[PDB]
């Protein structure tokens, strides 16, 4: 039954809205990005501040870790992505090609590719080793809110303000599936399940949906939260009970039972929109992050 997430740490340091928080795949770290143009690294278990990584000329929407936890990629309003050495804090590559703000980014599981989505309505696939753009997908007809690889990196899912989710063949760059639902509200977030079998999508009508994307069938929805404006990150939590975790525009983190769709916990504490949540890879730990009235990251721990 219910999780019992309690507040363990509040991480202050960013001087503007925080955009994204991500745990390293090794479970060691949390990375955060912010409108303040900075990436900060924190200890996942002790909340200790480790380092600040700088170099972007404008605010940063997203950050993501390579599979060996040695590299970070960030997506910035400055129209670039940057690849960072976590150890030195140094910018290794600047990925240039997008014609407007880059909103979202991920490594493939192999961590030889980066996928990016932009205000410029494209999705780009980049070679990690060289930093070169390998493919530009004419992905959507409005800003791209999220990009994610499946478990083997053979597929990419993207979401957009155009009301669509798309599934892409990574190797060829061909669209394999376009999802539509209801009256096509903006799709503000999407990701694959840990196994790759499903996609979880948020739309700006206060709804998360779980999809069997190949069958084109919605299996569950998660509602009760507030999501009408911001591109709020959501997650599968699989270390204990099977939960859906999301931020919300009423300053709370919402946790649902994945199967029953019931709200099982609401986490109070933040003082602005919780735009990002992350789930720890091995421990029942949530990181959550909030917008400019708050600017803090919170770490929470549960027994299941
Ligand atoms: C630097 C910074 C700090 C705090 C918040 C944001 C932000 O809200 N991000 C953003 C904006 C838009 C965005 C901005 C302006 C727009 N006009 C029309 C559509 C549209 C979308 C789309 C996606 C995203 N994100 C959210 C965070 N996530 C981890 C990745 C994606 C950025």
Swiss-Prot record:
InterPro entries referenced in this protein's UniProt entry, alphabetically: G-protein_beta_WD-40_rep, WD40/YVTN_repeat-like_dom_sf, WD40_repeat_CS, WD40_repeat_dom_sf, WD40_rpt
Covalent cross-link (Glycyl lysine isopeptide (Lys-Gly) (interchain with G-Cter in SUMO2)), residues: 16
N6-acetyllysine: residues bearing it: 82
Pfam families: Beta-prop_WDR5 (PF25175)
Family matches, as SMART domains: WD40
Record GO cellular component, one term: MLL1 complex
UniProtKB keywords: Acetylation, Chromatin regulator, Host-virus interaction, Isopeptide bond, Nucleus, Repeat, Transcription, Transcription regulation, Ubl conjugation, WD repeat
Effect of residue 17 to E: Strongly reduced affinity for histone H3
Similarity comment: Belongs to the WD repeat WDR5/wds family.
Name the UniProt record assigns to this protein: WD repeat-containing protein 5
């Amino acid at each position: 039954v219910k999780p019992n997430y309690a507040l363990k740490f509040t991480l202050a340091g960013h001087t503007k809205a925080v955009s994204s928080v991500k745990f390293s795949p090794n479970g060691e770290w949390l990375a955060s990005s912010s409108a303040d143009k900075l990436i900060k690294i924190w200890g996942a278990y002790d909340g200790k501040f480790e380092k600040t990584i700088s170099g972007h000329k404008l605010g940063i929407s997203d950050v993501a870790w390579s599979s060996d936890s040695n590299l970070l990629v960030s997506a910035s309003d400055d129209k670039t992505l940057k690849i960072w050495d976590v150890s030195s804090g140094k910018c290794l590559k600047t990925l240039k090609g997008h014609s407007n703000y880059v909103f979202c980014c991920n490594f493939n599981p192999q961590s030889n590719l980066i996928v990016s989505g932009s205000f410029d309505e494209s999705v780009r696939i980049w070679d990690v080793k060289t930093g070169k753009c390998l493919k530009t997908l004419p992905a959507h007809s409005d800003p791209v809110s999220a990009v994610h690889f499946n478990r083997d990196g053979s597929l990419i899912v993207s979401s957009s303000y155009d009301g669509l989710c798309r599934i892409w063949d990574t190797a060829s760059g061909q669209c394999l599936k376009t999802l539509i639902d209801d009256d096509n509200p903006p799709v503000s977030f999407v990701k694959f399940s840990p196994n790759g079998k499903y996609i979880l999508a948020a739309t700006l009508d206060n709804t998360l949906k779980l999809w069997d994307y190949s069958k084109g069938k919605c299996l569950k929805t998660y509602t009760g939260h507030k999501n009408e404006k911001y591109c709020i990150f959501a997650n599968f939590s699989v270390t204990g009970g099977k939960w859906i975790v999301s931020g919300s525009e009423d300053n709370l983190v919402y946790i649902w039972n994945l199967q029953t769709k019931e709200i099982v916990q609401k986490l109070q504490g933040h003082t602005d929109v919780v735009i990002s949540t992350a789930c720890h890879p091995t421990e029942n730990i949530i990181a959550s992050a909030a917008l400019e009235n708050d600017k803090t990251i919170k770490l929470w721990k549960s027994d299941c």
